[PDB]
Design a protein around this nucleic acid. Sequence first.
RNA 1: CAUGGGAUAACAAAGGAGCAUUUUUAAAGGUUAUUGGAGAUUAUGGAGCUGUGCGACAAAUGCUUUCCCAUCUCGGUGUGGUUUAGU
Lengths: 84, 129, 148, 92, 142, 199
Amino acid sequence: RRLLRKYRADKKIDRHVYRDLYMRAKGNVFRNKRNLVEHIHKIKNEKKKERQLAEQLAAKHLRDEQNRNKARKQELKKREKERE
Amino acid sequence: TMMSVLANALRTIASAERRGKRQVLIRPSSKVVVKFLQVMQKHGYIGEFEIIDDHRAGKIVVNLNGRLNKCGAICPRFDCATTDYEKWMKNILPSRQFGFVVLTTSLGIMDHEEARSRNTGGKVLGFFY
Amino acid sequence: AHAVDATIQHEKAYQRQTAVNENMHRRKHVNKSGHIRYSKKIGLGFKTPAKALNGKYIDRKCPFTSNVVIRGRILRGVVHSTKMHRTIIIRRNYLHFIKKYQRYQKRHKSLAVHCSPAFDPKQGDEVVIGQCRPLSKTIRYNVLEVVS
Amino acid sequence: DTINAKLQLVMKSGKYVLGTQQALTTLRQGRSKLVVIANNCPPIRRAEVEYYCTLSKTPIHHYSGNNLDLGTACGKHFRTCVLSVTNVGDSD
Amino acid sequence: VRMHGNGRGKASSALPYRRTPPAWLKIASRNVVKMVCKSSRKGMMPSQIGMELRDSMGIAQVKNVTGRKILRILKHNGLAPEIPEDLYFLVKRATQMRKHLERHTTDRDTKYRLILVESRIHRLARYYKRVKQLPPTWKYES
Amino acid sequence: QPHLRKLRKLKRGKPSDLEESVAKALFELEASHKTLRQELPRFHVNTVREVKVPRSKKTVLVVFYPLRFLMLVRKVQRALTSELEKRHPGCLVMLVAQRQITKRPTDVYKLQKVQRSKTSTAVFENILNDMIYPSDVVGRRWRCRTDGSKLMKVFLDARDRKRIESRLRAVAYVYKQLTHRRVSFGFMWNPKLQQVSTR
RNA sequence: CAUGGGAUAACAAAGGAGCAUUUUUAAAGGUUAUUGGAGAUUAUGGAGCUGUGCGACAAAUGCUUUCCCAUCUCGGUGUGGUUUAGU
Ligand SMILES: [Mg+2]
């Protein structure tokens, strides 16, 4: 619990991960400090991988929106120029 | 719950033929049912039939000449090799001289004599004689 | 003259590939990142994953970055469990024909398959597995491709 | 119940505040449009909220259930004695 | 009617073969969309919206006018119910029974109806989870 | 020429005689006619196809327009076809939207991805609706004769009999020329009760 | 195990706003061949990357729109129906 409070105060973990690990520590899931630290590092690595994937998807979405808007404005220019 | 539309249709036709009716209404309709009806119509066991569109599974009105002794579906659709035609003719047909076994082949829905001539197997749909 | 990679090295013995010497730079065994990494093209028209070519993981049982070769049966299955480390259980579902009743039964077989870190399959994913030498008591196959 | 449908709609689209203290805060301002009080409410607190509603000309509804029922009808997992909807959110 | 009971009722509506809206219906497609969207914002489920338009505006079928179903229109505007409409009504049914059964513990008939309603929910929820109209790990709670 | 704006830009270079005549009529109607004035400026056609109906007088001017103008045409189609017909004596004018058909795939996975409006069944029934638009199909039958033929009969409301009966033969022939499919027409005075009219 | 057929089915995916135009041109910016090899260094351009324009096409759904403010008897057709337009 002391390690978990220190990690939460140092912002290595967020309050949700803190709550999950607090209930797991009450539940005899971690044998010692090193086991808890290893679990924390595994969770952090998984979060980093998932967040990298989310950033990649977000970038792809923003590029798709840019292409759609550019095509729409090109269409507007085409329709205005066809007016002759 | 209705599980086989073809079996329902063939059962309805067989009942109408047993009662000697001139026409019978089939509901629901299907592509397989229409293909089966065209096979029977090709060999002359039924007359003209009309497909009625209702923006759902349609209905079929079949005119019946009294030439159809019995028609029925075979469930499940057992696989039939080209060597198994004689076995099925023995088991379900009244004779070797008349009656047809209807197959689902990759070349389409056809009677067993046509399928044998095309050297193709498939799944048995039903029979009529 | 590189720094010891913390992420890879946690096994009480230095983790390294046995095909190349990572200390001395040569051309072909150098990936995009510039590190010396061994990778081979397995046969049967299977592309080497980009993570195998440019990744940093060390796996002595990977079909693309080690001496494990693929020969024999190429099978298809669906991932069933990923609870082990670098190993997955796949399930092959099939119909068995009972001759007497002219009908089928649903049957399944479970296989332990080594999964390279180049892939990240989840339960329900379909994978292509190739036969290799016995890697453990039960493992006889390696993951070659993942289809989501 | 009509009030249950209206509350569900306000939760969906409108703006609301839960608790007696925040309801009194919205009543002191000119923001409250409707006040819902559970039949469980302590009588003095209910009298105080009703007095605020009368001074502010705010409609007041006496819910047929208790604070647990009001919290459930709000889609909440806690109990609320007083509800105050600040924006009906097209409800009524 | 059929599921969880011996009823064999056939009562239903029979949609017409001719889908073209009548010539006297002068309401434009866009105005209908504003009507359904504002009726949903008024707090009506898709079924209630359709009955309102049918009985008052002469709009027999919203789909035959706008080309889109009422729920589809709400989804496009984001107004779709979070929980599907029917699953909402069954859950409300089960809740109302359970409130009744708290006070009447001897009401064994309502207990029997409650089992059916919940055993119906756990197949409807299975369907919506398989169809991804509901989150995975969505569970009905008594 | 200003009337050439009522054609697709590809056709403006060397328009046909029928296309130029239709384009000129559309350009005049866009200002002369009260109802057409509010719709025709946003409108242009693809091509004009002439169809000779055997054993009949007059011809059929099949006018193809982009499918994106479907609702625009349906708004004023009855006025538009009547105006074009009086512009072209001895002719019938049919406004058919140009629709694309995706050939039916042989793969079950590609079949699930087919846009249902691009299927031949949907397109062919939409073309039939285009050529009879003021009237609507009230019933559809398939007569499967004993010789293997399958003829489709389409029933129209008997009210529209005095308005569409003359052009029904032309509609049937143009439908066969465009879809390579045969159609027969009948009239029901009580489509609800499926009651056919004798005459 | 290879190959041909695709009717009947199976497996998988989706749950439909949970979604996705091409082609001319020019200009603006930012560890490849070839120079006779081989070892540096350089710069020059390709080619992609954006944005500025430009020409020719399409487009399954009308921006010559929509919404929000504000000012105010003639032809064709059939043997009578049809878009007008006068009553
Ligand atoms: Mg049951």
